[PDB]
Short mmCIF file of N, CA and C in Angstrom, two decimals:
data_model
loop_
_atom_site.label_atom_id
_atom_site.label_comp_id
_atom_site.label_asym_id
_atom_site.label_seq_id
_atom_site.Cartn_x
_atom_site.Cartn_y
_atom_site.Cartn_z
N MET A 1398 89.90 166.83 -125.24
CA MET A 1398 90.83 168.43 -126.23
C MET A 1398 90.92 168.89 -125.58
N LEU A 1399 90.05 169.41 -125.35
CA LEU A 1399 89.47 170.73 -125.30
C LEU A 1399 88.63 171.12 -123.35
N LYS A 1400 89.94 172.57 -122.93
CA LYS A 1400 89.71 172.65 -121.57
C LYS A 1400 89.33 173.92 -121.41
N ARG A 1401 89.06 174.25 -119.99
CA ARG A 1401 88.95 175.92 -119.39
C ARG A 1401 89.23 175.34 -117.96
N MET A 1402 90.93 176.35 -118.06
CA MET A 1402 91.61 176.63 -116.48
C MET A 1402 91.53 177.73 -115.74
N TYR A 1403 91.19 177.63 -114.73
CA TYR A 1403 90.95 178.88 -113.79
C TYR A 1403 92.19 178.80 -113.07
N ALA A 1404 92.61 180.12 -112.64
CA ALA A 1404 94.31 180.10 -111.73
C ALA A 1404 94.54 181.15 -110.79
N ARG A 1405 94.37 181.44 -110.08
CA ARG A 1405 94.53 182.31 -109.18
C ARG A 1405 96.58 182.25 -108.61
N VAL A 1406 96.23 183.67 -108.85
CA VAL A 1406 98.01 184.50 -108.88
C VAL A 1406 98.33 185.10 -107.26
N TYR A 1407 99.10 184.75 -106.51
CA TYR A 1407 99.60 185.27 -105.51
C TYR A 1407 101.12 185.44 -105.58
N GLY A 1408 101.22 187.54 -105.87
CA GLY A 1408 102.31 188.12 -105.40
C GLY A 1408 102.78 189.39 -105.38
N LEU A 1409 104.31 189.08 -106.36
CA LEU A 1409 103.58 191.28 -106.47
C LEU A 1409 103.76 190.56 -108.30
N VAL A 1410 102.60 190.74 -108.55
CA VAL A 1410 101.72 190.28 -109.66
C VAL A 1410 101.40 191.45 -110.00
N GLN A 1411 101.24 192.58 -109.72
CA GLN A 1411 100.41 194.09 -110.27
C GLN A 1411 101.08 194.53 -110.42
N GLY A 1412 100.94 195.68 -111.64
CA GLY A 1412 102.19 196.31 -111.57
C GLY A 1412 103.58 196.06 -112.18
N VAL A 1413 103.75 194.86 -113.43
CA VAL A 1413 104.96 194.36 -113.39
C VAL A 1413 105.54 193.50 -114.45
N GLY A 1414 104.18 193.87 -114.91
CA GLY A 1414 103.80 193.47 -116.82
C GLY A 1414 103.23 192.31 -116.55
N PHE A 1415 103.22 191.03 -115.47
CA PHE A 1415 103.11 189.78 -115.53
C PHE A 1415 101.95 189.62 -116.64
N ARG A 1416 100.64 190.42 -116.21
CA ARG A 1416 99.52 190.19 -118.33
C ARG A 1416 99.78 190.31 -119.11
N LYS A 1417 101.19 191.32 -119.13
CA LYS A 1417 101.11 191.37 -120.63
C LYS A 1417 101.99 189.57 -120.91
N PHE A 1418 102.89 189.63 -120.29
CA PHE A 1418 103.62 187.97 -120.20
C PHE A 1418 102.34 186.93 -120.75
N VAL A 1419 101.15 186.90 -119.99
CA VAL A 1419 100.54 186.33 -119.69
C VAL A 1419 100.10 185.73 -121.07
N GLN A 1420 99.95 187.08 -121.29
CA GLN A 1420 98.41 187.03 -122.48
C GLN A 1420 99.20 186.54 -123.99
N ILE A 1421 100.45 187.10 -124.25
CA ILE A 1421 101.51 187.07 -125.74
C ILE A 1421 101.99 185.91 -125.30
N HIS A 1422 101.43 185.10 -124.09
CA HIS A 1422 102.14 183.28 -124.51
C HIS A 1422 100.70 182.41 -124.73
N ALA A 1423 99.76 183.06 -123.64
CA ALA A 1423 98.15 182.91 -124.42
C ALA A 1423 97.87 182.77 -125.68
N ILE A 1424 98.53 184.13 -126.26
CA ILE A 1424 97.80 184.35 -127.33
C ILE A 1424 98.61 183.37 -129.08
N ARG A 1425 99.72 182.80 -128.74
CA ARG A 1425 101.16 182.31 -129.40
C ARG A 1425 100.17 181.05 -129.15
N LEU A 1426 99.61 180.51 -127.82
CA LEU A 1426 99.09 178.77 -127.86
C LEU A 1426 97.66 178.39 -127.94
N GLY A 1427 96.94 180.08 -129.25
CA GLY A 1427 96.22 179.81 -129.49
C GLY A 1427 94.64 180.33 -128.70
N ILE A 1428 95.54 180.15 -127.02
CA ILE A 1428 94.33 180.18 -126.14
C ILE A 1428 93.36 181.95 -125.84
N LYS A 1429 91.50 181.81 -124.99
CA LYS A 1429 91.26 182.57 -125.38
C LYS A 1429 91.06 183.02 -123.73
N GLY A 1430 90.27 183.68 -123.44
CA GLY A 1430 89.71 184.16 -121.67
C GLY A 1430 90.67 185.69 -121.54
N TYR A 1431 90.81 185.51 -120.00
CA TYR A 1431 91.22 186.83 -119.81
C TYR A 1431 92.17 186.58 -118.49
N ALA A 1432 93.17 188.19 -118.05
CA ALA A 1432 93.34 188.01 -117.05
C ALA A 1432 93.25 189.68 -116.14
N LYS A 1433 93.05 189.19 -114.68
CA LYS A 1433 91.92 190.08 -114.31
C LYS A 1433 92.59 190.36 -112.89
N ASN A 1434 92.88 191.49 -111.72
CA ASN A 1434 93.88 192.52 -111.99
C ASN A 1434 92.48 192.36 -110.38
N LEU A 1435 93.42 191.79 -109.99
CA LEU A 1435 91.88 191.64 -108.84
C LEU A 1435 92.71 192.82 -106.88
N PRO A 1436 91.33 193.42 -106.56
CA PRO A 1436 91.48 194.39 -105.33
C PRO A 1436 92.71 194.82 -104.87
N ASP A 1437 92.83 192.63 -104.18
CA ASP A 1437 93.97 192.30 -102.69
C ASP A 1437 95.47 192.01 -103.44
N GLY A 1438 95.26 192.17 -104.91
CA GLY A 1438 96.73 192.44 -106.00
C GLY A 1438 97.09 190.52 -106.27
N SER A 1439 96.16 190.26 -106.05
CA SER A 1439 96.20 188.64 -107.48
C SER A 1439 95.87 188.58 -108.42
N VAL A 1440 95.86 187.86 -108.89
CA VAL A 1440 95.20 187.84 -110.16
C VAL A 1440 94.91 186.81 -110.53
N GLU A 1441 93.14 186.53 -111.41
CA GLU A 1441 92.47 185.78 -112.23
C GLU A 1441 92.72 185.79 -113.59
N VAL A 1442 92.98 184.13 -113.91
CA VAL A 1442 93.19 183.39 -114.70
C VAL A 1442 92.00 183.05 -114.77
N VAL A 1443 91.55 183.26 -116.49
CA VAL A 1443 90.56 182.14 -116.96
C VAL A 1443 90.92 182.19 -118.38
N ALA A 1444 90.88 180.77 -118.82
CA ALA A 1444 92.01 181.26 -120.05
C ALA A 1444 91.13 179.31 -120.89
N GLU A 1445 91.28 179.83 -121.86
CA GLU A 1445 90.54 178.14 -122.76
C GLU A 1445 91.31 177.98 -123.96
N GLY A 1446 91.20 176.70 -123.72
CA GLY A 1446 92.00 176.33 -125.06
C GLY A 1446 92.53 174.72 -125.54
N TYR A 1447 93.29 173.94 -126.23
CA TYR A 1447 93.75 173.15 -126.17
C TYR A 1447 94.61 172.50 -125.34
N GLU A 1448 94.07 170.49 -124.32
CA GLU A 1448 94.32 171.03 -122.64
C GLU A 1448 96.15 171.01 -122.95
N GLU A 1449 96.91 170.79 -123.74
CA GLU A 1449 98.52 171.23 -123.99
C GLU A 1449 98.66 172.69 -123.67
N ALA A 1450 98.52 173.05 -124.75
CA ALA A 1450 98.52 174.60 -124.49
C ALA A 1450 98.23 175.26 -123.15
N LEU A 1451 96.71 174.68 -122.03
CA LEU A 1451 96.85 175.06 -121.06
C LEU A 1451 98.05 174.79 -119.89
N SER A 1452 97.76 173.81 -120.87
CA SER A 1452 99.33 173.22 -120.20
C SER A 1452 100.78 173.99 -119.66
N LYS A 1453 101.33 174.23 -121.44
CA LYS A 1453 102.07 175.48 -121.36
C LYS A 1453 101.86 176.73 -120.80
N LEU A 1454 100.77 176.68 -120.61
CA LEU A 1454 100.80 178.31 -120.45
C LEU A 1454 100.58 178.24 -118.88
N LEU A 1455 99.91 177.89 -118.16
CA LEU A 1455 100.25 177.55 -116.48
C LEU A 1455 101.88 177.38 -116.03
N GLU A 1456 102.41 176.63 -116.87
CA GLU A 1456 104.22 177.02 -116.38
C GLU A 1456 104.61 178.59 -116.88
N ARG A 1457 104.06 179.35 -117.72
CA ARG A 1457 104.09 180.90 -117.62
C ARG A 1457 103.55 181.62 -116.56
N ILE A 1458 102.06 181.31 -116.40
CA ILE A 1458 101.66 181.45 -115.14
C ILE A 1458 102.20 181.07 -114.25
N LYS A 1459 102.42 180.62 -113.78
CA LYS A 1459 104.03 180.26 -112.89
C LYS A 1459 105.72 180.87 -112.37
N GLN A 1460 105.36 180.92 -113.77
CA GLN A 1460 107.41 181.69 -114.04
C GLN A 1460 106.39 183.18 -113.67
N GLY A 1461 106.72 183.82 -114.72
CA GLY A 1461 106.00 185.55 -115.06
C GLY A 1461 107.19 185.64 -115.58
N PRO A 1462 106.92 187.42 -115.64
CA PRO A 1462 108.36 188.12 -116.56
C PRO A 1462 109.28 188.08 -115.04
N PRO A 1463 110.35 188.28 -115.49
CA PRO A 1463 111.70 188.73 -114.09
C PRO A 1463 110.87 189.51 -113.09
N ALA A 1464 110.00 190.55 -113.63
CA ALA A 1464 109.65 191.44 -113.03
C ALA A 1464 108.82 191.32 -111.87
N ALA A 1465 107.69 190.07 -112.60
CA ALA A 1465 106.88 189.08 -111.08
C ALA A 1465 106.94 188.48 -109.84
N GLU A 1466 106.88 188.71 -108.91
CA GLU A 1466 107.34 187.38 -108.34
C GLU A 1466 106.37 186.36 -108.25
N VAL A 1467 106.06 186.00 -108.18
CA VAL A 1467 104.82 184.96 -108.51
C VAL A 1467 105.02 183.90 -107.84
N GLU A 1468 104.48 183.80 -105.97
CA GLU A 1468 104.61 183.21 -104.90
C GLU A 1468 103.26 181.92 -104.98
N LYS A 1469 102.78 182.36 -105.18
CA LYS A 1469 101.57 181.37 -105.16
C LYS A 1469 100.45 180.58 -106.58
N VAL A 1470 100.34 179.64 -107.35
CA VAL A 1470 99.27 179.33 -108.15
C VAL A 1470 98.23 178.22 -107.42
N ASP A 1471 97.32 178.48 -107.32
CA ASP A 1471 96.20 177.83 -107.72
C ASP A 1471 95.52 177.65 -108.94
N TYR A 1472 95.47 176.86 -109.17
CA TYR A 1472 94.81 176.52 -110.79
C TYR A 1472 93.69 175.09 -110.85
N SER A 1473 92.36 175.71 -111.46
CA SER A 1473 91.58 173.90 -111.26
C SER A 1473 90.85 174.00 -113.13
N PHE A 1474 90.46 172.81 -113.64
CA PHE A 1474 90.30 173.25 -114.83
C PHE A 1474 88.60 172.88 -114.80
N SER A 1475 88.00 173.31 -115.85
CA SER A 1475 86.92 173.08 -116.09
C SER A 1475 85.70 172.48 -117.03
N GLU A 1476 85.08 172.65 -117.95
CA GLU A 1476 84.21 172.22 -118.79
C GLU A 1476 84.47 173.50 -119.53
N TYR A 1477 85.55 173.44 -120.76
CA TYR A 1477 85.86 174.53 -122.41
C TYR A 1477 84.08 174.92 -122.93
N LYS A 1478 83.89 176.30 -122.57
CA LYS A 1478 82.49 176.56 -122.63
C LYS A 1478 82.46 177.42 -124.16
N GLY A 1479 83.94 177.35 -124.71
CA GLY A 1479 84.25 178.21 -126.08
C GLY A 1479 83.57 180.17 -126.40
N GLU A 1480 83.68 180.39 -125.99
CA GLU A 1480 82.97 181.55 -125.98
C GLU A 1480 83.41 183.08 -126.36
N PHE A 1481 84.28 182.85 -125.19
CA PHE A 1481 85.54 183.74 -125.37
C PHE A 1481 85.94 184.28 -126.76
N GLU A 1482 86.41 185.28 -127.29
CA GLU A 1482 87.14 185.16 -128.81
C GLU A 1482 88.52 186.39 -128.84
N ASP A 1483 88.39 186.69 -127.68
CA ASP A 1483 90.17 186.88 -127.61
C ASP A 1483 90.56 186.95 -126.44
N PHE A 1484 92.02 187.21 -125.96
CA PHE A 1484 92.56 187.27 -124.63
C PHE A 1484 92.90 188.22 -123.92
N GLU A 1485 91.73 189.03 -123.07
CA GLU A 1485 91.66 190.57 -122.68
C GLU A 1485 91.81 190.84 -120.90
N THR A 1486 92.10 192.17 -120.69
CA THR A 1486 92.42 191.88 -119.56
C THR A 1486 91.38 193.11 -118.77
N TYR A 1487 90.92 192.45 -117.50
CA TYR A 1487 90.08 193.78 -116.80
C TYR A 1487 90.66 193.89 -114.96
#
């Protein structure tokens, strides 16, 4: 039922509202975790919730808002730990 999803996102994905787009969708889907800006310009997303919710969020992560140029997303799944209480940015 529940999983953790990790995604790393490459392209033009900083300074373009990419994480605001991801956050709005994560909240709608009941997902907790975070989207973190890495120094190299990539974004890490850690997301926990229902597996179907994560599948839907992954679609949005790959899509991005129009200003974002999403070129590649590497992702994987692991055990839901249930420790996140909100969806944050770092």
